[PDB]
Ligand binder design. Structure first.
Ligand SMILES: Nc1ccn([C@@H]2O[C@H](COP(=O)(O)OP(=O)(O)OP(=O)(O)O)[C@@H](O)[C@H]2O)c(=O)n1
Ligand SMILES: [Mg+2]
Ligand SMILES: [Zn+2]
Lengths: 302, 1319, 251, 66
DNA sequence: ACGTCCCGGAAGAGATTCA
DNA sequence: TGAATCTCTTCCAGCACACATCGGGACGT
RNA sequence: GCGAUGUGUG
């Protein structure tokens, strides 16, 4: 609703504000009931496709492994490499960045000591074994599943990972659903921030940029998935941002910026159609009434 | 000044806004609706009269015989309500109807041979409505919830988006008639107008157009506007209206009447149109390469021969131009088809027409309605005439016609009940005009489209259905004429009507079982507005915008009271002041506002009419003249709501409550709680069980008075008088004189209802509150009902609470209760169960009720008497025998107390089917009831006679007071006492006739009552006698029960505590309940904390009075103190003074305050922090409301003072001894050998699908095997398991699940073959 | 099924079968009289529609109804649906030796044990109690044992302590979601009628004490007790299986 | 998708238990699709051990014998 | 009377657009 | 002449309780 | 000791 309550329970509420609060709370309840139905159906489907799967061999004996990197959203690194690769059998030995100094052998179980070693030596890529590429018939070998949870040691031989996995995925969908109301009817809404405010001294690295230099001497971006990155003064990747289409960059690529130096600036409520060439404009295939409509400003006469 | 009863406890009352409209009688819906249903209203107009005048007279095939109507009547009910509840009958009244039968003459004009009136033919029964607004059906007391369904009329809906996956909206217009077949019009993504009927397959709307007998030329002339071309020597002068000169580029240089006026290419601007208008020319000149894009209007034939040149609705080309040019048709008409003004929708639909004329149209209608059968001409003609034009099978209500003519922007709001050609055509024109851009859709949630039925309307519809079936029967038997050898008692058949009305009141999603455990529960279950049931929508097809709340609800339906769960928002509860319109919509009050003066004349407004006006809002400061105090004030106009000018408002809201319901306006400080907690508060307060010693709430919202007075549970005195006799059974009032009739003088008697059963087993009960020799006034209470204190709605009891953690014993919510509470029996509720025991005579022989039972003991029989039925008062426990019953074999089949419940037997009923002999205790109870009836009617006559003779003795003071000759003779010998020749002897004639009539009515009623009690009974086919027994369980409080505040603070009372351990305060008194602080700022209900503080203020004032009253204090002191307390606060309404209380009423007022000075707080115009601080400081209590407390165990102080106060808490009928249950081995289901389910049946739980997943997720596998093989199903398995156990050897031997074996049998009974391959 | 009386409420399978048999019989009668072709054709169609209803009502057009207006249940509906034998009696079964009550707190518990009211205990462990009674010799037959445990003579409470001492029981909370929805506990007999629950486990059951109800089951066989002790105990689960972080967090 | 990879399964008691039974039974019928136990839900339907934990040791024994 | 009947999603199959 | 795309029809929509009423009428002996 | 509907719980 575009009319926010402007009062708090310690103060009174006139009748209208309370009425709007009613809008909100009935949202809460209705969504609990119906979305509960949805989530329950979901977990059912999951545990009936992920059922016939049971750890069965102690070691498949392969070498495929997916890659693991820290995940960043634009502020603090959200889920760092330690949290992602805690407890999982390294596929291919991780070289210390002193290349040819093999730091961990290629079938170790990265428990907490090894996670601390990786954090100290500042590694940002580990190739680790993963169930999706396990070469065992009718099941999944032990190592390829990595560290069990709920117990410290490695997975056993039998623990039906299918069902526990399906439940742990489908559960917090239901549990949050049946609880979403007692925040109230509040609106979990956050603006687009309209600009990328870098946080720490470092360098700049763009990925998938197709820019062009507008009249005023700036650099606008004419590419879709453009991803901006802040590198630190040791080479590490610290920040990653999504620069939307048509945004205005302050600095180009490969230029030392410092903290609090707004690099990007766009309009969070408009996807412009910026050009790349310069000249005159003709409307092509624009017939009134059929496709376009032609309004007029009374005030400006235009 | 106050009602003398109010002067017993005059509640302090905050609240600033002066009220103007008292609360209306909270059962208007139910009571007015049924009273309107069943009442001799003349001139038809919504009654049984109406149903009869609409179905009668039934005429044969003019068979010179016809059945016509006279008048109807209802006998008295055979059984009054109480006997009817006890026995199981419907509290019904017969329906006696006067039906005349006229017999005309053959071989004559319409002349009668002989008419006959089989006076009052009987038909069916109709259940009357008890004064409370509840129906009785089978010994239970059932309630009919009003239905909120879509108003019969027309609606132009959109259905945007979803369909066609292209964003192209459609526009379907629906005609919804109150009784008959629907009708729908809708476009297609090809801009074709298609009709459908009863949601069957689809048809081309023009087919129904010319099934109404139109021709294609007529159709086009109705829908489109003509265009005139004139053949002349020079380019066929076209007639050009400037309206058709917008938005496009004309295909020629526009000159006419001389010089060029609008040049080609120049898209005609508005100023160009103005030029043209100033030019005074519409005969202009056109090219020829334009008409190629037009369509001919009507048929053109060749005038030389007489053959078609081009038919109507056909496009053009130069060849056709010349062909119709040769004959010289100087004027040609086409259809003005702009793509922006007039889409050729009717044109395209006509092109798509697969039909020819009326014949083929009706053929198609028939073929798509009743598929696959010969389209006989008469058949299709009769069908179409009987779908939208027959007074029988199609009818809009008068409401239908109103809403219809209103939505079509017609003029008058009355007319025929059937459709018409013009009405269908207006519907279509409006639909197309919506498609063009003018007009709007009609949203359905808007309360200008929903509509409230009620018992009157629904029962009337069902009774009409009964009548159509009886008319089939009557007409069928009458057409086979027979001269006079019958009369209107055999031509009729009461059975279909009776069955129909029984079906309605019994089996439906509306007529349901009343939650009769709490006055509030009754009164908020009668005012319910369900959107489900027949005619309404269903939960599975339930949309989502309908579950949302809508801005027209403001003051018509409560926003914050909806049953949370599977059907939210469909079960709205009604507001406080809201009323039903004359037609059926929900109207609400307002206050008329002239220039700047808020007149106190109320003014009801419906839904739609609320939109046009600007309405102010109730919390607007206005100063002693009806003038607002600002010059811009908050108001709401149409959905929006903002600040408007002072002299623009037109209606001010009545009171600050009118937005909420009765269920929600009993919560103090509502405006400090989140809506979710207000909602849960409304529910829990609806579920609270009455207690043993009722107790007012210190902190209410003033609505207790109206709720408790108009809930019916109490006995509101009718004629104010002086109490003559009080007694825990009855109350006998003398009437004041000026409030009495000349004759019929007498006095009033209220028979209270002592301990009896509710529908949720709580004990409904009444207690006299007025003491002997005491005035009472009209409209006043005498008897406290269940949970009423001096006529105030007191559900729970108020206890001293203190918010603090306390050794975890209140970890989540677990309230902790001190033993002081359980000692003073201040939750000791009472239940009353009803146990039955039937006796049947079957094959092998009957079943006796003899006291002798095979294989039982003299101890187990002592409580039985010499017949086999327990005494009254035998304090049985679990396992005893209540009624000794055996079956022939002989096998024990007695009735026994359900395991776990203790308690006392308080009443025993015996019913014996007529014919079987009555046993000795049945005779005993027979005579007991007889003597009670005799004594009661004799008390009637004696006390009433006492009153009458007292009045006569009062009369003869003036007119021959003869003390001697008056007390000489027995006062009954007052026929001829010395009185002058005046009218006073006439008045004595009046009174003496009343006395003789009392004589005879006593005689006749006594005789009839003796007959009732003597006679046998009518019972279920296949039964001999029934013995009902009632118990009186007294369930205490105990760790497990659920108590709750009034704001969502639930909680399972966890540990009962000794008196010591309670954190006693700085003075000695130990707090009585410890809640949990961490529960508040999470459950965002900050309301309960203010409730606590204000309660502590109230009780502080209470103890100050208690001291000033214990130390006797020269009542001047009490007067001063009470006066200060009532005058405290900001500008408030109360303004009581204590110089008009006679200086003894004040002593009684203090007597009733010494428990604590009650306080009101109307819902939104309530108290404030400043006022509570000021009140506390009037008391001797700390300003913060927080005290230091000392721990009961270690005796050392707490850090950081805590909050104490008195919070009003409630018990809830979710009790641990009704929830706890346990099964080791019992019965087993019959088809799949599994244990039964439930508690009544001794069933075990349901180890369900997700539990099986949990066990699979663990490694456990043997547990799961025994959990679904041995513990549950496999029969060999579990007998062997039981024996292995009782031998000490724990081991299983699985086998196979029997229900799996059943799955095999079913898949095998299909064609499929499932087997079990060899190992 | 016999209802209350000598009357049998309608049973849908028997109804369908009865209909099909009547159609079959009438058509058998027509095919011994050289009946006319239109009538034998109409009757074959009726028999076909009847068998279609029997196998799977409703997959054809207007389904039949028997009570007033609800489609009666055919074999495909004995198998399909949320209430066919699959999702109703072959995966989730009702179980003996079970019980249920309301929960409350009692912070004096070690976290591997839960209170359990005397009456639920005596009702659940009845077979074990019989065993120990006629093992000690206080009652010869089984009926004497049944009399004794029903009358609740004061020996059964010592018997019951000895048959509880080291015997896990499974507690469960109704909407079970993740594999912590079922845990084990050793019992401790209590007065009253509410199951007591250690406070560090409401985090796993998602159980506030505002009125929740929990169900107890008893593991019968010896292997099952060992499972309830070595896989499902409360102590053996102090780490969630979703994320590694603990699940016995104080709340 | 999951709600297809669960139906197109080698077993058919699983599928039959999941989300529709008409289609699965008719297809399995016309193909004569012999189903082993081979999984968890099949073995639970039929009511025996579950090749998951303790049951997994048992099924080692059983597959070893055959 | 007893006895004896009467809504998102998706995949199949029109059907309409390329030639 | 064939491959897209628009139409209609089947199939599913969370778990565990607790309690209440109610169960088909229409005609020869 | 079956199935429908209904109300109400977590
Ligand atoms: N359709 C529903 C409704 C409720 N619940 C159960 O009820 C719990 C929520 O209880 P509730 O009291 O309604 O909310 P809470 O926040 O837990 O407690 P409170 O309402 O007092 O704040 C959910 O976790 C869920 O276990 C459910 O499973 N399914
Ligand atoms: Mg809760
Ligand atoms: Zn592997």
């Amino acid at each position: 609703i575009e009319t926010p309550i402007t009062a708090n329970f310690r103060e009174g509420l006139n009748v209208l504000q309370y009425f709007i609060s009613t809008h909100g709370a009935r949202k809460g309840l209705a969504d609990t009931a119906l979305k509960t139905a949805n989530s329950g159906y979901l977990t059912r489907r999951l545990v009936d496709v992920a059922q016939d799967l049971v750890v069965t061999e102690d070691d498949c004996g392969t070498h495929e492994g997916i890659m693991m990197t820290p995940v960043i959203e634009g502020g603090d690194v959200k889920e760092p490499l330690r949290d992602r690769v805690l407890g999982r059998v390294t596929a291919e030995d991780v070289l210390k960045p002193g290349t040819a100094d093999i730091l961990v052998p290629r079938n170790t179980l990265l428990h907490e000591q090894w996670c601390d070693l990786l954090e100290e030596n500042s590694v940002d890529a580990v190739k680790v074994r993963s169930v999706v590429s396990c070469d065992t018939d009718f099941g999944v070998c032990a190592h390829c599943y990595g560290r069990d949870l709920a117990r410290g040691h490695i997975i056993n031989k039998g623990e039906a990972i299918g069902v526990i996995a399906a439940q742990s995925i489908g559960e917090p969908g239901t549990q949050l659903t049946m609880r979403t109301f007692h925040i109230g009817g509040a609106a979990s809404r956050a603006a687009a921030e309209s600009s990328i405010q870098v946080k720490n001294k470092g360098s700049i690295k763009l990925s998938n940029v197709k820019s062009v230099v507008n009249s005023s001497g700036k650099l606008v971006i004419t590419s879709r998935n453009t991803e901006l990155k802040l590198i630190d003064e040791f080479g590490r990747t610290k920040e990653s941002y999504k620069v939307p289409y048509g945004a205005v960059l302050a600095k180009g690529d490969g230029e030392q910026v410092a903290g609090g130096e707004t690099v990007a600036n766009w309009d969070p409520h408009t996807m412009p159609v910026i050009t790349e060439v310069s000249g005159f404009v003709r409307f092509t295939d624009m017939i009134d009434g059929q496709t376009i409509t032609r309004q007029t400003d009374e005030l400006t006469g235009l | 000044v106050y009602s003398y009863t109010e002067k017993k406890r005059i509640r302090k009352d905050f609240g600033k806004r002066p009220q103007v409209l008292d609360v209306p009688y909270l059962l208007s819906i139910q009571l007015d609706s049924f009273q309107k249903f069943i009442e001799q209203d003349p001139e038809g107009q919504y009654g049984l009269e109406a149903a009869f005048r609409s179905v009668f007279p039934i005429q044969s095939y003019s068979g010179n015989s016809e059945l016509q109507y006279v008048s109807y009547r209802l006998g008295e009910p055979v059984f009054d309500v109480q006997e009817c509840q006890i026995r199981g009958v419907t509290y019904s009244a017969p329906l006696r109807v006067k039906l005349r039968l006229v017999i005309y003459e053959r071989e004559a004009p319409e002349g009668t041979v002989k008419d006959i009136k089989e006076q009052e033919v009987y038909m069916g029964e109709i259940p009357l409505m008890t004064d409370n607004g509840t129906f009785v059906i089978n010994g239970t007391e059932r309630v009919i919830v009003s239905q909120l369904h879509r108003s019969p009329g027309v609606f132009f809906d959109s259905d945007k988006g979803k369909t066609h996956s292209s964003g192209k909206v459609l526009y379907n217009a629906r005609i919804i008639p109150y009784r008959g077949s629907w009708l729908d019009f809708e476009f297609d993504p090809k801009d074709n107008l298609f009709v459908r009927i009863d949601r069957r397959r689809k048809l081309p709307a023009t087919i129904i157009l010319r099934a109404l007998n139109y021709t294609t030329e007529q159709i086009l002339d109705l829908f489109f506007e003509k265009v005139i071309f004139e053949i002349r020597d020079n380019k066929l002068q076209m007639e050009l209206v400037p309206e058709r000169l917008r938005g496009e580029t004309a295909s020629f240089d526009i000159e006419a009447n001389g010089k060029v006026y609008v040049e080609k290419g120049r898209r005609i601007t508005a100023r160009h149109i103005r030029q043209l208008e100033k030019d005074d020319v519409k005969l202009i000149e056109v090219p020829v390469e334009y008409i190629a894009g037009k369509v001919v209007a009507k048929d053109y034939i060749d005038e030389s021969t007489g053959e078609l040149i081009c038919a109507a609705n056909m496009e053009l080309s130069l060849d056709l131009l010349a062909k119709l040019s040769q004959s010289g048709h100087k004027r040609i008409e086409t259809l003005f088809t702009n793509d922006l003004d007039h889409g050729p929708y009717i044109s395209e639909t006509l092109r798509v027409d697969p039909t020819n004329d009326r014949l083929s149209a009706l053929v198609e209608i028939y073929r798509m309605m009743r598929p696959g059968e010969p389209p006989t001409r008469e058949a299709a003609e009769s069908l179409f005439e009987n779908l939208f034009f027959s007074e029988d099978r199609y009818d809009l209500s008068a409401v239908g016609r109103m809403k219809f003519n209103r939505s079509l922007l017609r003029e008058e709001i009355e007319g025929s009940g059937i459709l018409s050609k013009d009405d269908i055509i207006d519907v279509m024109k409006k639909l197309i005009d919506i498609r063009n851009g003018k007009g709007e859709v009609d949203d359905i949630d808007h309360l200008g489209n929903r509509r409230i039925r009620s018992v009157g309307e629904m029962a009337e519809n069902q009774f009409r259905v009964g009548l159509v079936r009886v008319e089939r029967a009557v007409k069928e038997r009458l057409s086979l004429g027979d001269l006079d050898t019958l009369m209107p008692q055999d031509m009729i058949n009461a059975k279909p009507i009776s069955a129909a009305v029984k079906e309605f009141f019994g089996s439906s999603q509306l007529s349901q079982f009343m939650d009769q455990n709490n006055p509030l529960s009754e009164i908020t279950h009668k005012r319910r507005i369900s959107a489900l049931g027949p005619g309404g929508l269903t939960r599975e097809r339930a949309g989502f915008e309908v579950r949302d709340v809508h801005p027209t609800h403001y003051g018509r339906v409560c926003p914050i009271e909806t049953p949370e769960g599977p059907n939210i928002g469909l079960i709205n509860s009604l507001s406080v002041y809201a009323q039903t319109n004359e037609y059926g919509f929900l109207e609400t009050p307002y206050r008329k506002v002239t220039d700047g003066v808020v007149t106190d004349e109320i003014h009801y407004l419906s839904a739609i009419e609320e939109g046009n006006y600007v309405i102010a809002q109730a919390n607007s400061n206005l100063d002693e003249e009806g003038h607002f105090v600002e010059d811009l004030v908050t108001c709401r106009s149409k959905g929006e709501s903002s600040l408007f000018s002072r002299d623009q408002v037109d209606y001010m809201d009545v009171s600050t409550q009118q937005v909420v319901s009765v269920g929600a306006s009993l919560i103090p400080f509502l405006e400090h709680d989140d809506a979710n907690r207000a909602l849960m508060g409304a529910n829990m307060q609806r579920q609270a069980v009455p207690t043993l010693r009722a107790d007012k709430p210190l902190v209410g919202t003033g609505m207790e008075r109206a709720v408790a007075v108009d809930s019916g549970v109490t006995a509101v005195a009718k004629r104010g008088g002086v109490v003559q006799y009080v007694d825990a059974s009855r109350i006998v009032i003398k009437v004041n004189e000026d409030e009495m009739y000349p004759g019929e003088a007498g006095i009033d008697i209220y028979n209270l209802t002592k301990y009896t059963r509710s529908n949720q087993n709580t004990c409904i009960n009444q207690m006299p509150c007025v003491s002997l020799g005491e005035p009472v006034e009209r409209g006043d209470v005498l008897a406290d009902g269940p949970s009423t204190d001096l006529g105030e709605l007191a559900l729970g009891q108020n206890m001293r609470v203190a918010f603090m953690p306390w050794n975890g014993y209140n970890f989540e919510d677990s309230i902790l209760v001190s033993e002081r509470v359980v000692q003073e029996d201040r939750f000791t509720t009472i239940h009353i169960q009803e146990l039955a025991c039937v006796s049947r005579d079957t094959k092998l022989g009957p079943e006796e009720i003899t006291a002798d039972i095979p294989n039982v003991g003299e101890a187990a029989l002592s409580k039985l008497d010499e017949s086999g039925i327990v005494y009254i008062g035998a304090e049985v426990t679990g396992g005893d025998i209540l009624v000794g019953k055996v079956t022939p074999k002989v096998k024990d089949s007695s009735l026994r107390v359900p395991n776990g419940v203790s308690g006392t037997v308080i009443d025993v009923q015996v019913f014996t089917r007529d014919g079987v002999e009555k046993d000795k205790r049945a005779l005993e109870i027979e005579e007991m009831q007889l003597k009670q009836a005799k004594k009661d009617l004799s008390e009637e006559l004696q006390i009433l006679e006492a009153g009458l003779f007292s009045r006569i003795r009062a009369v003869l003071v003036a007119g021959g007071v003869e003390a001697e000759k008056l007390d000489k003779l027995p006062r009954d010998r007052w026929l001829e006492l010395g009185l002058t020749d005046e009218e006073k002897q006439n008045q004595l004639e009046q009174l003496a006739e009343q006395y003789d009539e009392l004589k005879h009515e006593f005689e006749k009623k006594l005789e009839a009552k003796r007959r009732k009690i003597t006679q046998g009974d009518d019972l279920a086919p296949g039964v001999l006698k029934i013995v009902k027994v009632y118990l009186a369980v007294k369930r205490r409080i105990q760790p497990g029960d659920k108590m709750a505040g009034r704001h969502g603070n639930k909680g399972v009372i966890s540990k009962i505590n000794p008196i010591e351990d309670m954190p006693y305060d700085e003075n000695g008194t130990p707090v009585d309940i410890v809640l949990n602080p961490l529960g508040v700022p999470s459950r965002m209900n900050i309301g309960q904390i203010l409730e606590t503080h204000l309660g502590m203020a109230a009780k502080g004032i209470g103890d100050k009075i208690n001291a000033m009253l214990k130390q006797q204090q020269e009542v001047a002191k009490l007067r001063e103190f009470i006066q200060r307390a009532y005058d405290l606060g900001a500008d408030v309404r109360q303004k009581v003074d204590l110089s008009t209380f006679s200086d003894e009423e004040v002593m009684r007022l203090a007597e009733n305050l010494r428990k604590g000075m009650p306080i009101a707080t109307p819902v939104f115009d309530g108290a404030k922090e400043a006022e509570i601080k000021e009140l506390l400081k009037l008391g001797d209590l700390p300003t913060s409301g927080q005290i230091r407390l000392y721990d009961g165990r270690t005796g050392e102080q707490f850090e950081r003072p805590v909050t104490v106060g008195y919070m009003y808490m409630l018990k809830l009928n979710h009790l641990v001894d009704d929830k706890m249950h346990a099964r080791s081995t019992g019965s087993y289901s019959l088809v799949t050998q599994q244990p039964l389910g439930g508690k009544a049946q001794f069933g075990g739980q349901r180890f369900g699908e997700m539990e099986v997943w949990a066990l699979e997720a663990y490694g456990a596998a043997y547990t799961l095997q025994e959990m679904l093989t041995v513990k549950s199903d496999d029969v060999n398995g579990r007998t062997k398991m039981y024996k292995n156990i009782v031998d000490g050897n724990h081991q299983m031997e699985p086998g196979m699940p029997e229900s799996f074996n059943v799955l095999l049998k079913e898949i095998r009974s299909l064609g499929i073959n499932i087997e079990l391959e060899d190992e | 099924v016999p209802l209350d009386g000598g009357r049998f409420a309608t049973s849908d399978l028997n109804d369908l079968y009865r209909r099909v048999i009547n159609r079959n019989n009438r058509l058998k009668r027509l095919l011994d009289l050289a009946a006319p072709d239109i009538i034998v054709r109409n009757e074959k169609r009726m028999l076909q529609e009847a068998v279609d209803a029997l196998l799977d009502n409703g997959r054809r057009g207007r389904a039949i109804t028997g009570s007033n207006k609800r489609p009666l249940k055919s074999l495909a509906d004995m198998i399909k649906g949320k209430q066919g034998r699959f999702r109703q009696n072959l995966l989730g079964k009702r179980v003996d030796y079970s019980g249920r009550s309301v929960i409350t707190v009692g912070p004096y518990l070690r976290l591997h044990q839960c209170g359990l009211p005397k009456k639920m205990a005596l009702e659940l462990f009845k077979p074990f109690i019989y065993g120990k009674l006629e093992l000690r010799g206080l009652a010869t037959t089984i009926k004497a044992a049944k009399k004794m445990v029903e009358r609740e003579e004061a020996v059964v409470w010592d018997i019951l302590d000895e048959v509880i001492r080291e015997h896990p029981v499974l507690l469960n909370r109704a909407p079970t979601l993740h594999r912590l929805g079922i845990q084990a506990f050793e019992p401790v007999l209590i007065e009253g009628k509410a199951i007591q629950l250690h406070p560090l486990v409401c985090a796993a059951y998602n159980a506030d004490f505002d009125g929740d109800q929990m169900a107890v089951h008893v593991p019968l066989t010896l292997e099952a007790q060992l499972e309830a002790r070595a896989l499902m105990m409360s102590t053996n689960n102090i780490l969630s299986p979703a994320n590694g972080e603990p699940i016995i967090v104080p709340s | 998708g999951i709600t297809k990879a669960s139906l197109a399964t080698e077993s058919f008691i699983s599928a039959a238990s999941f989300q529709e039974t008409t289609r699965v039974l008719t297809e399995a019928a016309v193909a004569g699709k012999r189903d082993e136990l081979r999984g968890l839900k099949e073995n639970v339907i039929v009511g025996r051990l579950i090749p998951a934990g303790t049951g997994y040791a048992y099924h080692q024994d059983r597959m070893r014998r055959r």
